[PDB]
Amino acid sequence: MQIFVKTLTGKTITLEVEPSDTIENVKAKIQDKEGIPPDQQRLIFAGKQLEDGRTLSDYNIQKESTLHLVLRL
Amino acid sequence: MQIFVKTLTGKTITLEVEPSDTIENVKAKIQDKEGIPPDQQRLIFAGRQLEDGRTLSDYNIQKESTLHLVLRLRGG
Amino acid sequence: MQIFVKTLTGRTITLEVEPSDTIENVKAKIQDKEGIPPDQQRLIFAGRQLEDGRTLSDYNIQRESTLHLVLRLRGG
């Protein structure tokens, strides 16, 4: 499924992640496309933070759903 | 070293700790003075959140420094 | 007044500025000593970004305040 991730700076990026894929894998993909280490990423969907050991299905993320990516120290 | 913490109510509380004090350690002092639970205390310094396990030295906090105390709003 | 500028690792530099000093001017001081382009300088404080055309008085910054200097990369 094609997803759209947006950062606080407004930068948008299109990624291809499977519906049954874990957040851990998503972070790795972001590190590939953007170059931002997974341990520096923080995904927030609908105001709810996304944990690593969970699937996109656990957050009911539909197609074309805006995912927010902020900083994580 | 005296620091100034701005509460959510807009109250500037003055605390006395050491540079080697842990972030979460000072939180207890906020509860002893104001009564805000450390678990509800979200401290952010210059746009960057302070890790409870870190110290004031880690963020170069000195006397007269002001701390932004925000609400601990998590993913709901 | 002297202000503290924190990087990321821990290195904190101190620069003296005026109360009505513009952010773009402060960036120029950092570009001189540290040698970092102001266009790539992302100054964050209180959880918000400081605009170049704004003054220190605009954000209500006091003396002896530590700000965080982040890198402003322009990719996608």
Swiss-Prot record, chain A:
Identify the species of origin. Answer: Homo sapiens (Human)
Q: Which residues form the Ubiquitin-like domain?
A: 1-73
Relate the protein's function as given in its record. Exists either covalently attached to another protein, or free (unanchored). When covalently bound, it is conjugated to target proteins via an isopeptide bond either as a monomer (monoubiquitin), a polymer linked via different Lys residues of the ubiquitin (polyubiquitin chains) or a linear polymer linked via the initiator Met of the ubiquitin (linear polyubiquitin chains).
Q: What is the lineage of its organism?
A: Eukaryota, Metazoa, Chordata, Craniata, Vertebrata
Report the outcome of H68G. Answer: Loss of DTX3L-mediated polyubiquitination of histone H3 and H4
- What is known about its processing and modification? Phosphorylated at Ser-65 by PINK1 during mitophagy. Phosphorylated ubiquitin specifically binds and activates parkin (PRKN), triggering mitophagy. Phosphorylation does not affect E1-mediated E2 charging of ubiquitin but affects discharging of E2 enzymes to form polyubiquitin chains. It also affects deubiquitination by deubiquitinase enzymes such as USP30.
Q: Which residues carry this modification: (Microbial infection) ADP-ribosylthreonine?
A: T66
Q: Which gene encodes it?
A: UBB
Name this polypeptide is given:
Ubiquitin
What is the membrane topology noted in the UniProt record heading this document? Peripheral membrane protein
According to the UniProt record, list the residues that bear Phosphoserine.
S65
UniProt effect for mutating S65D: Phosphomimetic mutant that binds and activates PRKN
* Residues annotated as site: Essential for function: H68
Looking at the UniProt record, the site noted as Interacts with activating enzyme sits at R54, R72
Q: Which residues of the full protein are shown?
A: 1 to 73 of 229
- Compartments, record wording: Cytoplasm; Nucleus; Mitochondrion outer membrane
Say which domain of life the source belongs to: Eukaryota
Outcome reported for the amino acid change (mutating R72G) = No effect on ADP-ribosylation
Q: Where is this cross-link: Glycyl lysine isopeptide (Lys-Gly) (interchain with G-Cter in ubiquitin)?
A: K6, K11, K27, K29, K33, K48, K63
